Amino acid sequence: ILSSIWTEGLLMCLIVSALLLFILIVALSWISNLDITYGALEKS
Amino acid sequence: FYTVVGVFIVVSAMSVLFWIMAPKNNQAVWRSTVILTLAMMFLMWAITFLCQLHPLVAPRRSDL
Amino acid sequence: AGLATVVTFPFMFAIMFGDMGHGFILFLMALFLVLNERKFGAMHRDEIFDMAFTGRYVLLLMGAFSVYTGLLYNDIFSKSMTIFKSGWQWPSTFRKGESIEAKKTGVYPFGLDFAWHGTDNGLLFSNSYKMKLSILMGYAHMTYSFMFSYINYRAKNSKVDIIGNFIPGLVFMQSIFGYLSWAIVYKWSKDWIKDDKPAPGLLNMLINMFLAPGTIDDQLYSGQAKLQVVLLLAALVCVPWLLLYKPLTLRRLNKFNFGDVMIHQVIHTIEFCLNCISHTAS
Amino acid sequence: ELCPVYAPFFGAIGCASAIIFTSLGAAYGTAKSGVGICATCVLRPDLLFKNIVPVIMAGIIAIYGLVVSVLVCYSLGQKQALYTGFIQLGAGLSVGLSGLAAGFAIGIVGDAGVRGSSQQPRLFVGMILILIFAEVLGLYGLIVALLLNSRATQDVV
Amino acid sequence: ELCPVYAPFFGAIGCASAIIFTSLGAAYGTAKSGVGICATCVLRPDLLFKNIVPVIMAGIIAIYGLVVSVLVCYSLGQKQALYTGFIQLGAGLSVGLSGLAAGFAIGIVGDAGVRGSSQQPRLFVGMILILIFAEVLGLYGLIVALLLNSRATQDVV
Amino acid sequence: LCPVYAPFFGAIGCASAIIFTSLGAAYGTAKSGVGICATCVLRPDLLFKNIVPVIMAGIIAIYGLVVSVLVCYSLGQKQALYTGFIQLGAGLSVGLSGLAAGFAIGIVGDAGVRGSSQQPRLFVGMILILIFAEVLGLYGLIVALLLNSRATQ
Amino acid sequence: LCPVYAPFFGAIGCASAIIFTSLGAAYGTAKSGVGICATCVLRPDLLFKNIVPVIMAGIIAIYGLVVSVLVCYSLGQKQALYTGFIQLGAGLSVGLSGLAAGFAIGIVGDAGVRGSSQQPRLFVGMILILIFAEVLGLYGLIVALLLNSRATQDVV
Amino acid sequence: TELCPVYAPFFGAIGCASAIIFTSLGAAYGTAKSGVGICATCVLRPDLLFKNIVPVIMAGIIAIYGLVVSVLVCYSLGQKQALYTGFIQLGAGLSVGLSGLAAGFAIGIVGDAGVRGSSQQPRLFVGMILILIFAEVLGLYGLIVALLLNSRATQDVV
Amino acid sequence: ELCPVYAPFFGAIGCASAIIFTSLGAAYGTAKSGVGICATCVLRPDLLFKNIVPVIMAGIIAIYGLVVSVLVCYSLGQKQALYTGFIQLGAGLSVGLSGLAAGFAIGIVGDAGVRGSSQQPRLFVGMILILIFAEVLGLYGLIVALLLNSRATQDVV
Amino acid sequence: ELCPVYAPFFGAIGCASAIIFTSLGAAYGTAKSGVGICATCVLRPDLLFKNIVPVIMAGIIAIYGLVVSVLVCYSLGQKQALYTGFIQLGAGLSVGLSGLAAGFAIGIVGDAGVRGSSQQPRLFVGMILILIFAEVLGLYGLIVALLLNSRATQDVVC
Amino acid sequence: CCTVLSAFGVVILSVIAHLFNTNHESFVGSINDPEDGPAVAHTVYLAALVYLVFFVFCGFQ
Amino acid sequence: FSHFLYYLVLIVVIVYGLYKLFTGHGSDINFGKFLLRTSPYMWANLGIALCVGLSVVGAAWGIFITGSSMIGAGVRAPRITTKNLISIIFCEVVAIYGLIIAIVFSSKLTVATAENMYSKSNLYTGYSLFWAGITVGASNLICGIAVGITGATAAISDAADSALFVKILVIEIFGSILGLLGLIVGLLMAGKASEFQ
């Protein structure tokens, strides 16, 4: 057996849910860096 | 508990007797200071008496 | 508000500052300024000593109440006073170094008991006493200062403000935290050991009065499960009533901005119903 | 097995979380919108008790967190179920980490609303209405955690 | 084995995250697009009540989270299957992390749109049209979570 | 062969297939809607022809919704790891593809609707660029709908 | 049921009650002190009037001290794991909420004493906002006291 | 054994180390940041030099608070000591250290801002001391917490 | 069991860490003070051997590590108790991470005092007086580790 | 058990570290002071073989690392005690991570000294004086590592 | 200010010495308390006399 | 804060490895048994999905890099906006590479019998499809970004002078060698891999 706590199925759920959470953190850091061009909305 | 009511009677009668016998010079601070301080002294006495009238916790110590 | 302050501010001070030793020091350094108020009046006072001498009578009361409450506690430079006869006796024959309990003989006459001083579980009893003391004195201070609102609306001769703010405030405050302050006194009144009944927990009584009405795990009084439903409905009926009485009867007496009254009464209802919980814990 | 020893850990950390993240969101809502009150009531000191609304609506979030941290706490206990601990952790997080968002949205709206309602008096009702939409988020977290905490000890063996 | 003890953990996290991340999304949508209302209604306050549509369409996302949180909360149990916990975790994340995106889009489009609608009044219809496409993202997440939650306890053992 | 943790991957694939696709569609709607709102304050008659990038970003989210619905009709309590990981792959494919296609449509769309107000000949240019970025979501949808057909065989 | 590693959580709950409240009180004292020492150069008469944010910061550390003393006097070697978990929760409840209360008191106090020298009427607004910022730590105190009242209630 | 394993003095040595490490970090920040203000406001006002060293004395008291608890945890270490003893010695060490660190940050920031502006207004000297007292009782509280944890380290241990 | 095989690991890490972090602190205290000296006496080079005091007081807290990393080195055996390794690790960290703080403080106060002592001649006494409080930090760490190391093999078995 | 199979791992990464972390501090002391020589000797090229003393004293600590790496290398064996591997790891870290500090100090002091010794020629004897204190920090680590390595295989068994 | 501290040093230490002399249980009554009462009272009463010397000397200032 | 987590995970890995190694149990951190006992369908489906995902995140990357600068450079010179679309096309072909490799890989994805499930060939064709999906998705990612950068430079040098686009299209050709080389290597890696049996 691989382990009793860190079994064959838990340890490859925590790789899938680490890859997906990595893609999520990257995509949320893309959307967090999204700023509005305010000079093209004002009168000045 | 009736020795709390018996003290409430002699505090309340004293406060009513001071409401009518307050000095006329500064009435709204004679019958406001003295009547409220008797109320708060009786309130802390009643709270410190009823917590020991029927206690749930016994005093427990080792060094004696 | 500075005419009820003249007693309550030194007394709410003294509940936090409870000691006959520090209280006598503060009373003495206040009475030094009271007896010498003629030499200090015709004198240039800097800001800190101007603050201390402008209030030479707030500190005299703050010392005089601190002596009273530190005689209620047994706290004279954190020591006890064996003035009266104790309500607890210790066993005469016991082995050295073992944990012993005391048997209750009577009740201590004035103030807290002096057999709680060098005690392992004395701090649990002082926690229970001072927590319930703070709850009852905050309840008393709030229900005393809430009657002044009724006296204000009566002097303004506004029955609309009375029925819209005072009565739905009164039977919301008293139906929850007046019931809590009554339940503390009623638990202190019952014995719960001679009766061989379980002593109810009052935190998860008020938790379960709002979550699961009618279910009483430890019964505190006869008819509890049906009276708490009546008190819960009396408290919940005053959330729409305090929010909807005054704007809908100011609008009816114009048959004035209804948006400036309805939004103000919603903010008043949210603020008051928040503060009834937020101040009894403060 | 069904009610293990580490079971009240999740309940105690949920009771902690429901006031920790709630008070953090309410602290952002108090500080960020108190900056605006302390900046605009130098020019307009008559609007102190009028612009105090976002600080009060930030405090109502902390009241929502307090009333769930005092209901998870009396449902705690040794040898309680692990289901009860998971439900109390979920009800802790639902209040805390959504009152965190509601406090962000109250503070960073209320500062701009206090900056704006000293110039335009008609913007104050709009400020209150946006703050109601920002405070109903924490109210929704309160509703989810109360409906969740109602099922914590419901027919649990 | 099919119904383990740690199985309500994923269900409680799915009940929590559905309201947490939609409250984050609705909080950003209220916040970012309410700063624009409070900035552009100090000059033209007559259009205060029509700039409120980004805030309302942001607050719909929190209701999308609330519905899925209630429907996951009333399917939790002590002895539920691990399948049920996995489906409730998926339905919580499908509403939460999609309504977070919808709320980001509503906040950005609303703040960019209520600032440009005071200079050009014809941009309001375009702002509403873009915000409908931003709000159907959270609507699609609601559809996915309802189709999961109908599948949650159907043929479980 | 069919373990107890096997519908985790299918449920998280059904989750990610709408999560990552809605993140990409939200970026494509928000960033290209900033360009619409910035463009149409000085030339407002281009408002309903500049609306194409947010429509294409919506088509991306529809492509993700299709995969999420078609994965959640093949979930069961006692499915194999084969079905679970093939639903996971069908989720990851359309997730990364819709995320990439939505980022590309968002970054191309605001630049396109800004160049279209200065030069009118750039409308056909931005449409022909955005059509290449649209079908990347189709390129993940193909792998998702092929891995869906091999679910229970 | 009462293991050996059980007072670890109680010791961390006794530490974290004073550590994070001292961090919050230290942020509040630092921000408010930078405010005072930059606003009382030109207005030294209202120096002792502006020390109220620093007092409101210190009451947060007093709140942490009280919970840490009450958790300290309930530790033991052979205590339950439930007691350790409740003491950890009661430490974190007062600590990470007094940290937030200290952040709010520091920011509000800096922004209020830098502008209260210009407008004298802003002082009663600064006190009112700092009351709402200090009740944020009072709430964590209440949660910590209600937890610690049940740390040894029905414990075997 | 079980109540007193072999790895039990690890937590005691970490609690003896951290109590002086984090208070030395805090006292070092409170010395350096508030000594920049002393060395910057002395080139024009050198007569107030022995009175502007209040925020470095009040920061060096934090290091003495760490030293006392490190000595007291050091004289309670044993090879066959309880695991409870090591746990609450780690607790005492963290309670002194991570609170004296915060006290040192507050003393450094407040003392820098106070000796920077006390050369301009002479009435701010009584104000910055009153703020540094509130900044130094933060470490005094951690001292009290660790002295109460250290009185229970070997009290009812088996 | 009381003296395992992995027991000299903590003693060797303590013997290394006693000199490693004090060399880092002494390096910072020498580097910033040397930049301050070499930038303050291109105009007044008469203060060259006068301003060498921060470099000397930063070099003393590396001798503080060199003392304890020899006294720990001469108590390292193959069959030593794990208690001895734990105390030697605590002593190495107690000197190292305190002399690192002392070196940070000496390095900041040193160049801040030698760049200002070229202007005011009686800032030198104040610089020495602050550097004494910055160097007693490393002295306190030395005292803590010398009290630890006098107990690492006192009553060991 | 007392001399396990993984025991030469710590000796190998102590032989490696004593040149890695030493040479990447010597490289900082060479580069950061060499950009101060090449930027200064464009106007004073007669001081070229006099300002190169920071580069020489940065090269000396790499020889300090080389000696300890050779002496740890020639005490490696297939069947050696784990105590010997721990001691050799400690010696390698004691040379490497303190010669890194000495190289940082030589690099920061040396370019500040050579850019200042061309305006004032009486600062060269101060640069040497600060640089000896900056360079003895690696000699202290060499002393610690040699006193460790003399204790490595003294009373080892099994 | 030494006369105030000295007057309190007379009063407080005289009361403490009297409570050690009469074997009061708030000072002797515990195991950790000192065993002999008047042995502690003899060294607290001399400190009361020392503070009385300080009070008389600083009372003529 | 991310550096704090990078240091914390590193410290936890070092403390766990040294604790597991000192107590004589260091072979319990067993990466080979982890590879032997995880399901080959994880590696296969993960390789297919990351192939078609990371080809598209490079194609879409290059599309916005040489699309936004094409539209910016086309404001003054709008005679580039159709001729220069071959720079969109060269960075778009790296997605059809990953698509036609993902379908060829998914043809090797059948149901293996449980008695021969962790066999030599079934585990081989999980490893091969995993790394041959990675080496195609990452190569098409990097190729799409490189072709997008060298097309963004070409879109501005085209608007500068018309005779420069022919000269800088050659750099796009040398940049688009890379995705075709990844296309070759990912077919050679899973060339001998059989189906799941």
> Nearest residue on chain C to G146, judged by CA atoms?
C203
The CA distance from E28 to G19, in Å, is: 32
CB contact under 8 A, A24 and F30: no
Domain of E146, in residue numbers:
1-157
The CA distance from K42 to E14, in Å, is: 74
Cβ contact I–L (≥3 pairs, < 8 Å)? yes
Task: Give residues with Cβ within 8 angstroms of L64, minimum separation 6.
Answer: F103, F104, F107, F108, F133, L148
DSSP conformational letter for B59? -
Tokens 């699961």 — which residue? C212
Q: Which two tokens stand for residue C267?
A: 């903010």
Cβ contact I–H (≥3 pairs, < 8 Å)? yes
Coil/strand/helix, residue F114: helix
Which of I15, I11, I13 is closest to I156 using CA atoms? I11
Coil/strand/helix, residue I118: coil
CB contact under 8 A, I27 and J102: yes
Query: Are the beta carbons of F147 and F70 closer than 8 angstroms?
Result: no
Tokens 């759920």 — which residue? A13
A11 CA: distance to closest CA in chain F (Å): 11
CA angle at D69 for the pair D66 and D71, rounded to the nearest 5°? 110
Query: Are the beta carbons of G139 and G64 closer than 8 angstroms?
Result: no
Number of domains in chain J: 1
- What residues of I are in contact with residue L18 (Cβ under 8 Å)? 9
Query: Are the beta carbons of D146 and D90 closer than 8 angstroms?
Result: no
Task: Centre a 10 Å sphere on the Cβ of residue L18 and count the other Cβ atoms it contains.
Answer: 13
The 3 state secondary structure assigned to I22-61 is: HHHHHHHHHHHHHHHHHHHCCCCHHHCCCCCHHHHHHHHH
Task: Give residues with Cβ within 8 angstroms of A35, minimum separation 6.
Answer: none
Q: Which two tokens stand for residue F151?
A: 């679910």
Where helices occur in G4-80 by DSSP H, the ranges are 6-39, 52-72
Task: Give residues with Cβ within 8 angstroms of H105, minimum separation 6.
Answer: G26, G30, H26, H29, H30
Reported as type and span, the H/E element at residue D123 is helix D123-149
Largest CA distance in chain K: 45
DSSP conformational letter for B25? S
CB contact under 8 A, A8 and L42: no
Point out the residue among B28, B29, B47 whose CB comes nearest to the CB of C133: B47
- What residues of L are in contact with residue J6 (Cβ under 8 Å)? 21, 26
The CA distance from H149 to H91, in Å, is: 7
CB contact under 8 A, G37 and H113: yes
Q: Which two tokens stand for residue K53?
A: 């010397």
DSSP chain L: -HHHHHHHHHHHHHHHHHHHHHTT-GGGS-HHHHHHHS-HHHHHHHHHHHHHHHHHHHHHHHHHHHHHHHHHHTTT-GGGTTGGGHHHHHHHHHHHHHHHHHHHHHTT--PPPSTTSSSHHHHHHHHHHHHHHHHHHHHHHHHHHHHHHHHHHHHHHHHH-GGGHHHHHHHHHHHHHHHHHHHHHHHHHTSS-----
H1 to chain I, any CB pair closer than 8 A? The answer is no
Amino acid at C115: A
Q: Which two tokens stand for residue L166?
A: 């022919």
Q: C-alpha distances in angstroms, H75 versus A17, H16, H154, I151?
A: 48, 10, 12, 8
Inter-helix orientation angle F123-149/F52-72, to 10°? 0
Point out the residue among L41, L71, L88 whose CB comes nearest to the CB of F115: L71
Point out the residue among E97, E108, E115 whose CB comes nearest to the CB of A41: E115
The CA distance from L101 to L98, in Å, is: 5
Tokens 């309903």 — which residue? F48
Inter-helix orientation angle C238-250/C258-280, to 10°? 150
CB contact under 8 A, I42 and J2: no
Chain-centroid distance, C-alpha F144 = 12
CB contact under 8 A, C278 and D149: no
Coil/strand/helix, residue A8: coil
Pairing mode, if any, of strands C103-104 and B60-61?
unpaired
**First and final C-alpha spacing in chain B:** 32
Query: Are the beta carbons of H74 and H12 closer than 8 angstroms?
Result: no
Cβ contact L–B (≥3 pairs, < 8 Å)? no
| Secondary structure percentages of chain B, helix, strand, coil, to 5 | 65, 5, 30
Does 3.40.1410.10 match the CATH number of domain L5-190? no
Point out the residue among C207, C270, C274 whose CB comes nearest to the CB of D70: C207
Tokens 């002391």 — which residue? J29
Which of E43, E83, E98, E104 should we substitute to test contact with A (largest number of A Cβ atoms within 10 Å)? E104
Which of H15, H133, H23 is closest to H67 using CA atoms? H23
Q: Which two tokens stand for residue C143?
A: 């229900």
The CA distance from D43 to A8, in Å, is: 67
Q: Which two tokens stand for residue H108?
A: 């450094």
Amino acid at G94: V
D59 CA: distance to closest CA in chain C (Å): 9
Which of E152, E133, E157 is closest to E68 using CA atoms? E152
Tokens 């114009």 — which residue? C254
> Nearest residue on chain F to A7, judged by CA atoms?
F5
Which of H136, H97, H99 is closest to H16 using CA atoms? H97
> Nearest residue on chain L to J82, judged by CA atoms?
L22
CB contact under 8 A, F75 and E97: no
Point out the residue among A3, A8, A19 whose CB comes nearest to the CB of L38: A8
Tokens 């109590």 — which residue? H19
Tokens 């064959």 — which residue? A8
Which of B28, D131, D44, I123 is closest to E31 using CA atoms? D131
Q: Which of residues 2-41 of A touch F (CB under 8 A)?
A: 9-10, 13, 16-17, 20, 23-24, 27-28, 30-31, 34, 36-37, 40-41
CA angle at E11 for the pair E10 and E12, rounded to the nearest 5°? 90
- What residues of A are in contact with residue F19 (Cβ under 8 Å)? 24
Q: Which two tokens stand for residue B19?
A: 């409401």
Tokens 């905050």 — which residue? C138
Task: Give residues with Cβ within 8 angstroms of L80, minimum separation 6.
Answer: L70, L73, L74, L155, L158, L159, L165
The CA distance from E40 to E33, in Å, is: 11
- What residues of H are in contact with residue G61 (Cβ under 8 Å)? 137-138, 141
Query: What values do phi and psi take at E15, rounded to 5?
Result: -70, -35
CB contact under 8 A, H16 and I123: no
Which of G129, C275, G107 is closest to D49 using CA atoms? G129
Task: Give residues with Cβ within 8 angstroms of G99, minimum separation 6.
Answer: G20, G21, G23, G24, G27
Query: What values do phi and psi take at I81, rounded to 5?
Result: -70, 155
The CA distance from H99 to H13, in Å, is: 19
Query: Are the beta carbons of L59 and F136 closer than 8 angstroms?
Result: yes
| Secondary structure percentages of chain K, helix, strand, coil, to 5 | 70, 0, 30
Tokens 């009150």 — which residue? D37
- What residues of E are in contact with residue A24 (Cβ under 8 Å)? 97
Reported as half-sphere exposure (CB side, CA atoms, 13 A), residue I119 has a value of 12
Length of chain I: 157
Query: Are the beta carbons of L112 and L158 closer than 8 angstroms?
Result: no
Point out the residue among L28, L37, L46 whose CB comes nearest to the CB of A8: L37
CB contact under 8 A, E115 and A42: yes
The CA distance from C112 to C120, in Å, is: 16
Our separate counts of H helices and E strands in chain K read: 2, 0
E76 to chain A, any CB pair closer than 8 A? The answer is no
Which of D34, D11, D30, D33 is closest to D22 using CA atoms? D30
Q: C-alpha distances in angstroms, C79 versus C20, C65, H69, K54?
A: 10, 18, 27, 26
Coil/strand/helix, residue G152: coil
DSSP H5-56: -TTHHHHHHHHHHHHHHHHHHHHHHHHHHHHHHHHHSSSS--SSSSSTTHHH
CA angle at H31 for the pair H25 and H32, rounded to the nearest 5°? 90
Task: Give residues with Cβ within 8 angstroms of E153, minimum separation 6.
Answer: E75, E80, E81, E84
Task: Give residues with Cβ within 8 angstroms of L171, minimum separation 6.
Answer: L150, L153, L154
The 3 state secondary structure assigned to chain C is: CCCCHHHHHHHHHHHHCCCHHHHHHHHHHHHHHHHCHHHHHCCCCCHHHHHHHHCHHHHHHHHHHHHHHHHHCCCCCCCCCCCCCCCEECCCCCCCCCCEECEECCCCCCCCCHHHCCCCCHHHHHHHHHHHHHHHHHHHHHHHHCHHHHHHHHHCCCHHHHHHHHHHHHHHHCCCHHHHHHHHHHHHHCCCCCCCCCCCCCHHHHHHHHHCCCCCCCCCCCCHHHHHHHHHHHHHCHHHHHHHHHHHHHCHHHCCCHHHHHHHHHHHHHHHHHHHHHHHCC
The CA distance from G21 to G27, in Å, is: 10
Coil/strand/helix, residue G15: helix
CB contact under 8 A, E31 and D105: yes
The CA distance from L58 to L141, in Å, is: 4
Q: C-alpha distances in angstroms, D86 versus D55, E11, E74, J154?
A: 33, 9, 15, 57
CA angle at H88 for the pair H85 and H91, rounded to the nearest 5°? 150
Point out the residue among A2, A12, A16 whose CB comes nearest to the CB of L33: A2
Write down the experimental method used for this entry.
cryo-EM
- What residues of G are in contact with residue D79 (Cβ under 8 Å)? 1
Q: C-alpha distances in angstroms, K54 versus C29, J81, K5, K11, K51?
A: 21, 71, 9, 13, 5
Which of K31, K36, B60 is closest to C97 using CA atoms? K31
L28 to chain A, any CB pair closer than 8 A? The answer is yes
Q: C-alpha distances in angstroms, D129 versus D37, D126, E34, E52?
A: 18, 5, 10, 9
- Every domain of chain L and the residues it spans: 5-190
Which of E55, E87, E59 is closest to E72 using CA atoms? E87
Task: Give residues with Cβ within 8 angstroms of C49, minimum separation 6.
Answer: none
Query: Are the beta carbons of L41 and L126 closer than 8 angstroms?
Result: yes
Chains near I, with 3+ CB pairs < 8 A? H, J, L
Query: Are the beta carbons of I99 and I25 closer than 8 angstroms?
Result: yes
DSSP conformational letter for H124? G
Task: Please write down the long-range contacts of I124-128, taking CB distance under 8 Å and 24 or more positions apart.
Answer: I124/I50, I125/H49, I126/H38, I126/H39, I126/H42, I126/H49, I126/H50, I126/H53, I127/H39, I127/I53, I127/I54, I128/I53
Task: Give residues with Cβ within 8 angstroms of L59, minimum separation 6.
Answer: F100, F136, L91, L92, L94, L95, L140, L144
Coil/strand/helix, residue I116: coil
L22 to chain I, any CB pair closer than 8 A? The answer is yes
Which of L16, L37, L50 should we substitute to test contact with A (largest number of A Cβ atoms within 10 Å)? L37
Query: Are the beta carbons of J140 and I60 closer than 8 angstroms?
Result: no
- What residues of E are in contact with residue A10 (Cβ under 8 Å)? none
Q: C-alpha distances in angstroms, I40 versus D65, E153, J44, J52?
A: 58, 78, 21, 22
CB contact under 8 A, E102 and F22: yes
Query: Are the beta carbons of K54 and K6 closer than 8 angstroms?
Result: yes
Buried b (16+ CB within 10 A) or exposed e, K35-52: eebeebbeebbeebeebb
Which of I96, G77, I144 is closest to H93 using CA atoms? I144
Q: C-alpha distances in angstroms, A14 versus A7, A8, A17, F8, L129?
A: 11, 10, 5, 11, 21
Query: Are the beta carbons of G109 and G56 closer than 8 angstroms?
Result: yes
I86 to chain H, any CB pair closer than 8 A? The answer is yes
CB contact under 8 A, G139 and C281: yes
> Nearest residue on chain C to K31, judged by CA atoms?
C97
Task: Centre a 10 Å sphere on the Cβ of residue F45 and count the other Cβ atoms it contains.
Answer: 9
Handedness of CA L158, L163, L167, L170 (dihedral sign): positive
Amino acid at B39: A
Pairing mode, if any, of strands C103-104 and C100-101?
unpaired
Amino acid at L94: V
Cited resolution, angstroms: 6.6
Which of F25, F11, F14 is closest to F137 using CA atoms? F25
The phi-psi region of residue C78 (left if phi > 0; otherwise alpha if psi is between -120 and 50; otherwise beta) is: left
H129 to chain I, any CB pair closer than 8 A? The answer is no
CB contact under 8 A, D70 and G112: no
The 3 state secondary structure assigned to C187-242 is: HHHCCCCCCCCCCCCCHHHHHHHHHCCCCCCCCCCCCHHHHHHHHHHHHHCHHHHH
Reported as type and span, the H/E element at residue B61 is strand B60-61
Point out the residue among E23, E41, E59 whose CB comes nearest to the CB of D120: E41
Reported as half-sphere exposure (CB side, CA atoms, 13 A), residue G13 has a value of 34
D147 to chain C, any CB pair closer than 8 A? The answer is no
